Design a protein around this ligand. Structure first.
Ligand SMILES: C[C@@H]1C[C@H](C)CN(C(=O)c2cc(Br)ccc2N)C1
Ligand code: NI
Ligand code: NI
Length: 557
C-alpha cells in the first residue's frame, strides 16, 4: 500500500528553469531583498519524492460507513449530463500541455480534425477497455515563494485527449455534486465575502464557539485505492447516461486509482497508487474524501454542534466549546480518528477562541470600517506570497498572473489596494497595456480578464464598500508592515504617495481607465469622488465564477 513506487529515473524539466528572482528596472520599486524570493525547480524533485512516498493503513468504522451512506443518499438526487466533444474542447486552457499524439491546446480549442478525431478515439477506447492503466506524466512545478526553501510540488497528469475525455464524462458531476452532497460546508460555492459571512454567522451560532483548522500531511499521498473507489461509488449515485457511467468506471479503474509515471524524456519513473494531482476529479475527490473522513472523525470525537467548511484538502471546523481542557482532548480524538482514516496531521490542530486567528484556505477574517463608520468583516491573508509572486511577475511574463487573481480575491484588503493595484496599474499605464486581457486563476479554473474591468468585477463580487474600507485592525496593519520589512518593500506612506500619481494618470486616460482611477484609488485622495453603482457591473456574466473547485483540472472558463 505504498503511495509511490520509483524506478530511479529522474523527474526531468521541459525547458530551462530559473530559481533566482529575475531582476529588471522595475524590481527595486517593489522589493529590495531579492534573495528572499525563489522558485522551486526539478532540482529539488527528489526531496519531494521522499516526502510523498509512504505506506498507508486505513481502519474504517461505523461512523465512516454512516456518513458515506448519507452522502450517497444526497448524491442520488444529482442529475448530470454528458458534454459534447466541442463543449469539452472549449474548456481547455490555451497553455495546457500538448498531446503526445501530434496536437496541442490551440488545436483542441480550434476544434481541429486531428485533435477532435483523436479525442473520439480515446473516448471509444474508454468505453471498450475498463482495465488498462493509462499513461501519465510526472513533473516538478515551478512555483514562487519567500524564504521561511520548500521542495517543488509534483504534478501528475494524463494526455490532452484523456483530459478532454474527463471533461466529457465528469465536468457536470464535479461542478454539481459536491454542493448537493455537502450543502453549506462546500467551500468553493462562496465568493470571499460569502465565505466570511458563512464563518461569521457560524461562529455567532454557538453559545461558546471554538474553531480549528486541520492540516493533513501531504493529502494527495494519503488518498487510498479505497478512497478512490468510494468516490466513484458516490459519482455513480447520480442519474447519468449509460456512456457516462461506463466512461467514469473506466477512468476510475484506468486512471484515478493509480498508474505508471513517465518523465518528460519518456522514461518510466515509477508507479502511483494515490491521488493524481492533475486530473479533473482532483478538487472534487479531495473535498468529498476530506469531508467524509472529517465528518466521521467529528462523530468519533463527539464534537458538539460542529459545522465544517471544506475546500479540497483544506478543512476548518467550528463547534461548541466544552472548556479549554476538554477541547484539547476532543481534538486529540479527532486527530486519532483522521489518522486511522489515513489523513494524519501535519501540524496538530489547536483549538481557537478568536475567529480572526483561524487560518483556512490561507486566509482569515478581519475587521475594517466602511464609509458610514460601521465595522465590516472581510477576507484577508498574509501578503508574503502574493508579493513574492508579484515581484516575479514584475520582471517576467507568466501563463497565470497571480497579482490579478489576488486583486480580485483580496480587493477589500489594505495590501491588495495600496501595493498590488498601485504597482500593477503603474506598470500597465507605462506600457499602454491597460486594454490587454490577462489570464489568472480562481479556485483552480483559468479566466481571461481585462484589467480595465476591475472596478465592475470588484463591485459585483465584493460590493461598493470594497472601494471605501478604512481603519484596518492594528493586527492586520502590523502583519502587512512586518511583511514589508521582511521583503524590503517600501512602507505604505510611499504607496499612498504613488497611488495619487497612478490615480491622476488613469483619470487622464478617460473611459474605463478613468473608472479604475475613480473607484480603485479613491482611498488615496482627501478630496473623494462619489462612487455610484457601475452600469456595466450588472451586465457582467459572472456565472461559473464561484461554483466549484478545479485545481489540477485543466479548466478554462
Ligand atoms: C494604515 C495605512 C497607513 C498608511 C501610511 C496610510 N493609510 C492609507 O492610505 C489608507 C489606505 C487604504 Br487602502 C484605506 C484607508 C487609508 N487611510 C492607512
Ligand atoms: Ni495489503
Ligand atoms: Ni451508526
Amino acid at each position: 500500500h505504498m503511495s509511490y513506487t520509483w524506478t530511479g529515473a529522474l523527474i526531468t524539466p521541459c525547458a530551462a528553469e530559473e530559481s533566482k528572482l529575475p531582476i529588471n528596472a522595475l524590481s527595486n520599486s517593489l522589493l529590495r531583498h531579492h534573495n528572499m524570493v525563489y522558485a522551486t525547480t526539478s532540482r529539488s524533485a527528489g526531496l519531494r519524492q521522499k516526502k510523498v512516498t509512504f505506506d498507508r493503513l486505513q481502519v474504517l468504522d461505523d461512523h465512516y460507513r454512516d456518513v458515506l451512506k448519507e452522502m450517497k443518499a444526497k448524491a442520488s438526487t444529482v442529475k448530470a449530463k454528458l458534454l459534447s466533444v466541442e463543449e469539452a474542447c472549449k474548456l481547455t486552457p490555451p497553455h495546457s500541455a500538448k498531446s503526445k499524439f501530434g496536437y496541442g491546446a490551440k488545436d483542441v480549442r480550434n476544434l481541429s480534425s486531428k485533435a477532435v478525431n483523436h479525442i473520439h478515439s480515446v473516448w471509444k477506447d474508454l468505453l471498450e477497455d475498463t482495465v488498462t492503466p493509462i499513461d501519465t506524466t510526472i513533473m516538478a512545478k515551478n512555483e514562487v515563494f519567500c524564504v521561511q526553501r520548500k521542495p517543488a510540488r509534483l504534478i501528475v497528469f494524463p494526455d490532452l485527449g484523456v483530459r478532454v475525455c474527463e471533461k466529457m464524462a465528469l465536468y457536470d458531476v464535479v461542478s454539481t455534486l459536491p454542493q448537493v452532497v455537502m450543502g453549506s460546508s462546500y467551500g468553493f460555492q462562496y465568493s470571499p465575502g460569502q465565505r466570511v459571512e458563512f464563518l461569521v454567522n457560524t461562529w455567532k451560532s454557538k453559545k461558546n464557539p471554538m474553531g480549528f483548522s486541520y492540516d493533513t500531511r501531504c493529502f494527495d499521498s494519503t488518498v487510498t485505492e479505497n478512497d478512490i473507489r468510494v468516490e466513484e461509488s458516490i459519482y455513480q449515485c447520480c442519474d447519468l447516461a449509460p456512456e457516462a457511467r461506463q466512461a467514469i468506471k473506466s477512468l476510475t479503474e484506468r486512471l484515478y486509482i493509480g498508474g505508471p509515471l513517465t518523465n518528460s524524456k519518456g522514461q518510466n519513473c515509477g508507479y502511483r497508487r494515490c491521488r493524481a494531482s492533475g486530473v479533473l476529479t482532483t478538487s472534487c475527490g479531495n473535498t468529498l474524501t476530506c469531508y467524509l473522513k472529517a465528518s466521521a472523525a467529528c462523530r468519533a470525537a463527539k464534537l458538539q454542534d460542529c459545522t465544517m467548511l471544506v475546500n479540497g484538502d483544506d478543512l476548518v471546523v467550528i463547534c461548541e466549546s466544552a472548556g479549554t481542557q476538554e477541547d484539547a482532548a476532543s481534538l486529540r480524538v479527532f486527530t486519532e480518528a483522521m489518522t486511522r482514516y489515513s489523513a494524519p496531521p501535519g501540524d496538530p490542530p489547536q483549538p481557537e477562541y478568536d475567529l480572526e486567528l483561524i487560518t483556512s484556505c490561507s486566509s482569515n477574517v478581519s475587521v475594517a470600517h466602511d464609509a458610514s463608520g460601521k465595522r465590516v468583516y472581510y477576507l484577508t491573508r498574509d501578503p508574503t506570497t502574493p508579493l513574492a509572486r508579484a515581484a516575479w511577475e514584475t520582471a517576467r511574463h507568466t501563463p497565470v498572473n497571480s497579482w490579478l487573481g489576488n486583486i480580485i480575491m483580496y480587493a477589500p484588503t489594505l495590501w491588495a489596494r495600496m501595493i498590488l493595484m498601485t504597482h500593477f496599474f503603474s506598470i500597465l499605464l507605462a506600457q499602454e497595456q491597460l486594454e490587454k486581457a490577462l489570464d489568472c486563476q480562481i479556485y483552480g479554473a483559468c479566466y481571461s480578464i481585462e484589467p480595465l474591468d476591475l472596478p465592475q468585477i470588484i463591485e459585483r463580487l465584493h460590493g461598493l464598500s470594497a472601494f471605501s474600507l478604512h481603519s484596518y485592525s492594528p493586527g492586520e496593519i502590523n502583519r502587512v508592515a512586518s511583511c514589508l520589512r521582511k521583503l524590503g518593500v517600501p512602507p505604505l506612506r510611499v504607496w499612498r504617495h504613488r497611488a495619487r500619481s497612478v490615480r491622476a494618470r488613469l483619470l487622464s486616460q478617460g473611459g474605463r481607465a478613468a473608472t479604475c482611477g475613480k473607484y480603485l484609488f479613491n482611498w488615496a485622495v482627501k478630496t473623494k469622488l462619489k462612487l455610484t453603482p457601475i452600469p456595466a457591473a450588472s451586465r457582467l456574466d459572472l456565472s461559473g465564477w464561484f461554483v466549484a473547485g478545479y485545481s489540477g483540472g485543466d479548466i478554462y472558463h
